[PDB]
Amino acid sequence: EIGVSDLTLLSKVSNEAINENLKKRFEGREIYTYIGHVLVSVNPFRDLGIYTDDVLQSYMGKNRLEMPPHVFAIAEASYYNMKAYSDNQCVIISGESGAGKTEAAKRIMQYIASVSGGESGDIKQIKDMVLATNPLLESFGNAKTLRNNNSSRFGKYLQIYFNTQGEPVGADITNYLLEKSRVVGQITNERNFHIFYQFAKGASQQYRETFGVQKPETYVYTSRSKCLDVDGIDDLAEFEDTLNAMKVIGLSQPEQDQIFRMLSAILWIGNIQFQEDQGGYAEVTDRSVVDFAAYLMEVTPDQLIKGITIRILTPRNGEVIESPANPAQAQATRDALAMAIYSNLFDWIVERINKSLKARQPTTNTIGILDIYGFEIFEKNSFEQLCINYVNEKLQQIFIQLTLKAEQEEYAREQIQWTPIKYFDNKVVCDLIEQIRPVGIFSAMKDATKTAHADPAACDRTFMQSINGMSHAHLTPRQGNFIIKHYAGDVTYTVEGITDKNKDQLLKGLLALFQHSGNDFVHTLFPRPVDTDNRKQPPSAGDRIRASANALVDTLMKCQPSYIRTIKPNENKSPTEYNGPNVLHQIKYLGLQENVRIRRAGFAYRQDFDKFVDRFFLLSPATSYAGEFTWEGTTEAAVKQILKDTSIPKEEWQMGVTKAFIKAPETLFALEHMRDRYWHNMATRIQRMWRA
Amino acid sequence: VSEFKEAFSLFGDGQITTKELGTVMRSLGESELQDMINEVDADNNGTIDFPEFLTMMARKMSEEEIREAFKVFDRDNNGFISAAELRHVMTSIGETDDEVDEMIREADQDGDGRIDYNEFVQLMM
Ligand SMILES: Nc1ncnc2c1ncn2[C@@H]1O[C@H](COP(=O)(O)OP(=O)(O)OP(O)(O)=S)[C@@H](O)[C@H]1O
Ligand SMILES: CCOC(=O)/C(C#N)=C(\N)c1ccccc1
Ligand SMILES: [Mg+2]
């Protein structure tokens, strides 16, 4: 009732009209708006109470048009289409950092879990463990950044596996590169990962005694940033949520003890400080700190110190030199160890979740939910931000491909009358980053470190040269920095330290350290057999994210998409502040006007003749006798027969060369409901009991 | 299309009210009806039109056909259904336990808990 709930119904179409509609609605606590099947969600930054089980049930069994716009309707539609066409589904969610991708993802899972039923005990196991993954992963992969208090620092693709009854049988979490660097340092007023503050603040007495776990203010990794408390975040409550969820997922008390031993080791390693000896070498400042860190690592202090302070150099084939590190270099290796521990720990937690959630029955269909880290910009931007923004650029490209390009190309192939709508295709920006043969940003970084010289500075310089030499409309070299013209704006990346970040490779002596450990979990996180070939130049982080992203693209093009575009209305997390220009910028670079124009002129539904007959044959008496298919002619003529027999006006539908198109959503929902009520209408046909 | 217009004429502007629609529905054979009625208000608050009537009827929507329906339900595909599987489908679509027990009493003279629906179709007429 406020403005227009579906932007295709705007009286005048423009970015400014869209911005006005979203702003009136947002001011009236209507954060959800449609563009046809697509959902736009403006982040209210306030609990509006729209995710109650009362509301949730009010959306069960409805179509997009019978209820006000809601994330629940997107999830309902995905689950319906899954059991209707027996088709896998994927939900794509775009948004800047803090726009509310993660919250929308969780509301979709919530809807699926509630609606999908299942009374079996195993089923309820799945539903509860799936849900318990949220507090565990958020505690290990989310942290306070300047742009968002509960900021996803890892990417996630959750797949829910269903049996023929449409019940949750299993799940699978695919994780994208984690921001491990957070572990060892943060921008002022940012925090470390949530887990470290939960655990430092609320550690059990046992843990606090065996593992030395003090309060976060005593650790550099958790206090140096001058932020220990976050608005709206109770760390001790959340620590308890973490522990319960670990229990639900099936972690034994030893497994949990190992995890928290590693977290405590990280914090203690972080407090190791160095001074300069008589030769200029690194020397530990306080022996007691290293001693405790080594206890936690189950190694001798000599071993830990050596691993942190001595670099193994192989200049010739048969020559090996032990070079003592200077204090700066030793800090670098200290943080490299802390980061490696936390990263491998995270990967283990995700693998263990995957084991606990593995399909216990045969599986028929899947629903996938994408929750990536959103596009973001800081005063300093390094590799971390390049990787995140690259993933957002790839996701934009997927959106463009599906929402704008593919549909129009299909109109042209199917000889439907169409005047193409123009849009900005950002594939060139993706190319600029992910290109190999014409060296791109990642490839250039790899080539700079291809030489494998000890000094990163020279590699950064070689990289900056490569950048200067490139001529590309979206790239702008500067003095030790470079700007990318990303779909969502200009981002200035600092070149210093970028190539070592891209070359995410543990040093030889540090890898030598894990061999000496007495702890079985340490050996789990660091298998010795992968250290066989020192000579080889190993895969880079940009290689890994390139692979992850293009895997993702294949996955998503194998499933039926549903679309959520989230919008961040202000940078103060205010429930009342609506920054017109910022929303307008977002509306523009997301191409919401183009979506509006296509959706108005476009057809609402397109289906292959085969699947159309397979799904709608019951509607025609010609094509259906007693709920059994029977057609003597061609599939195309069966489609035409079914459409004639439903007696929908000829203007509502169109026949292509290979596919069949239905223009208005109402027509489609009508056909779908007629299909659903077929058994209902036969049973209704046996109701002439009252003779007179 | 014809059937809707002839049962729309029977119950003379061509813009019809919600009460008249309720009577039409009753004639054919509650809250959901008003739900269907309430999805177009721009034209008129308490009345609708004949294209709107096609719209809302499709959005809701002889001897041989009644014959067919029994074959639709029969999972065996042999002319015989479980009588309690007939009970269940008379319950679910709901269109009185005593009426279902009387109608199953007519067909319960078979005796094996199963129903030959060809004979019972002919009986029913
Ligand atoms: N639908 C919502 N209702 C109420 N509050 C919300 C809603 N969505 C987001 N918020 C609030 O905004 C904050 C950010 O939400 P997130 O889902 O974490 O954003 P995000 O897009 O996932 O951020 P990134 O990209 O991972 S850094 C949440 O913690 C909430 O306080
Ligand atoms: C979200 C992107 O995260 C990263 O890719 C990432 C981090 N953190 C690194 N490649 C990295 C590796 C080593 C040292 C510093 C950084
Ligand atoms: Mg998030």
Residue numbers in the entry:
A (entry chain A): 37 to 728
B (entry chain B): 9 to 19, 23 to 40, 45 to 76, 81 to 114, 117 to 146
Sentences from the paper on this structure:
Myosins have a highly conserved ATP- and myosin-binding motor domain, a force transducing lever arm containing one to several Ile/Gln (IQ) motifs, and a variable cargo interacting tail domain. Phenamacril is a novel reversible and non-competitive inhibitor of Fusarium myosin I. All Fusarium species have only a single class I myosin. Phenamacril (experimental code JS399-19) is an effective and highly species-specific fungicide, even though it targets the conserved motor domain of myosins, which are found in all eukaryotes. To identify the phenamacril binding site and to elucidate the structural basis of its mechanism of action, we have determined the crystal structure of phenamacril bound to the ATPγS-complex of the motor domain and IQ1 [FgMyoI(1–736)] of the F. graminearum myosin I encoded by the myo5 gene.
The model of the crystal structure contains 692 FgMyoI amino acid residues (37–728), which consist of U50, L50, and the converter domains, as well as the lever arm IQ1 segment that binds to FgCaM. The motor domain consists of the upper (U50) and lower (L50) subdomains, which enclose the actin-binding cleft in open state, and the converter, which functionally connects L50 and U50 to the lever arm. The converter adopts the pre-powerstroke conformation that is characteristic for myosins with open actin binding cleft prior to the release of Pi and ADP. ATP-γS, Mg2+, and structured water molecules occupy the canonical nucleotide-binding site in U50, while the outside of the cleft entry between U50 and L50 forms the actin binding site. The phenamacril pocket has a size of 238 Å3 and is located in the actin-binding cleft of the motor domain close to the predicted position in a previous modeling study. The pocket is lined by 17 phenamacril-interacting myosin residues: R189, L213, L214, E215, K216, S217, M375, Y409, F419, E420, C423, I424, D536, K537, N538, D540 and A577. The ethyl ester tail of phenamacril is deeply inserted into the pocket bottom while its phenyl group is oriented at the opening of the pocket. The amino group at one side of phenamacril, which is protonated at a neutral or weakly alkaline pH (crystals formed at pH 9), forms charge interaction with the side chain of D540, while the cyanide group at the other side of phenamacril forms a hydrogen bond with the side chain of FgMyoI S217. While phenamacril could affect more than one step in the myosin/actin cycle, its binding therefore likely arrests myosin in the “open”, pre-powerstroke state, similar to the proposed mechanism of myosin II inhibition by blebbistatin. The exchange against K353 both eliminates extensive Van-der-Waals interactions with the phenyl group of phenamacril and adds an unfavorable charge (ε-amino group in 2.9 Å distance from the phenyl group), providing a structural rationale for the effect of M375K on phenamacril specificity.
